[PDB]
């Protein structure tokens, strides 16, 4: 889902001026945020494997 998220967010970016604006504002931040949260979840399940 996240790979598809960054794909669609970048398509919503590269269209035009306000497209860049709204999509890089919302999902440009949401990609980093959901990615860091997601990789924290990666680390948690990896620690459960490690536990």
């Amino acid at each position: 889902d996240y790979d598809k998220f960054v794909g669609l967010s970048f398509t919503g970016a590269i269209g035009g001026i306000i497209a860049m604006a709204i999509t890089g504002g919302i999902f440009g931040a949401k990609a980093e945020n959901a990615r860091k949260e997601k990789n924290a979840l990666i680390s948690e399940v990896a620690e459960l494997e490690s536990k």
Binding site: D1, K4, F10, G12, I14, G15, T23
Partner: protein, 147 residues
């Protein structure tokens, strides 16, 4: 002790049935997201190149006459550019909506999983209860044997 036995057995039986019911519910929620993932996959047909592969066929033409439409031909150009842009927007909005629906059903799955965890903890508590009850009943039988 036997009344407590039967009451807790019926209790944990209802608990087990309810846990299986909630498992069926969350499996059905997991069946519901199939339409959402397939919809956003069949919308997912454009990625980083296909924007330019839309910018070029709107740059295409059929009829040319070298004069008298310097910008009149460009009217159709700019309007079809805005067509393809706004075609990307509304589908992007529907993409946003269905990802929010994904977050909603994932919240459903998470709350159901917490209910699963708590009811399974209560189920294991009742396992301890009914196990000790059955054990002391078996003791009572063995007590009568030693009698």
């Amino acid at each position: 002790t036997d009344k407590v036995l039967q009451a807790e057995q019926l209790r944990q039986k209802q608990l087990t049935e309810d846990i299986a019911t909630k498992e069926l519910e969350r499996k059905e929620i997991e069946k519901k997201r199939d339409k959402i993932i397939e919809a956003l996959d069949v919308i997912r047909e454009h990625n980083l190149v296909d924007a330019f592969k839309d910018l070029i066929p709107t740059g295409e033409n059929l009829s040319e006459l070298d004069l008298a439409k310097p910008e009149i031909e460009l009217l159709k150009q700019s309007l079809e550019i805005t067509k393809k842009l706004l075609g990307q927007f509304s589908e992007g909005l529907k993409y946003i909506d269905l990802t929010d629906a994904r977050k909603k059903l994932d919240n459903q799955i998470d709350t159901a999983s917490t209910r699963l965890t708590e009811l399974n903890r209560q189920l294991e508590q009742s396992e301890k209860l009914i196990a000790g009850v059955n054990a002391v009943i078996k003791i009572d039988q063995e007590k009568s044997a030693v009698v």
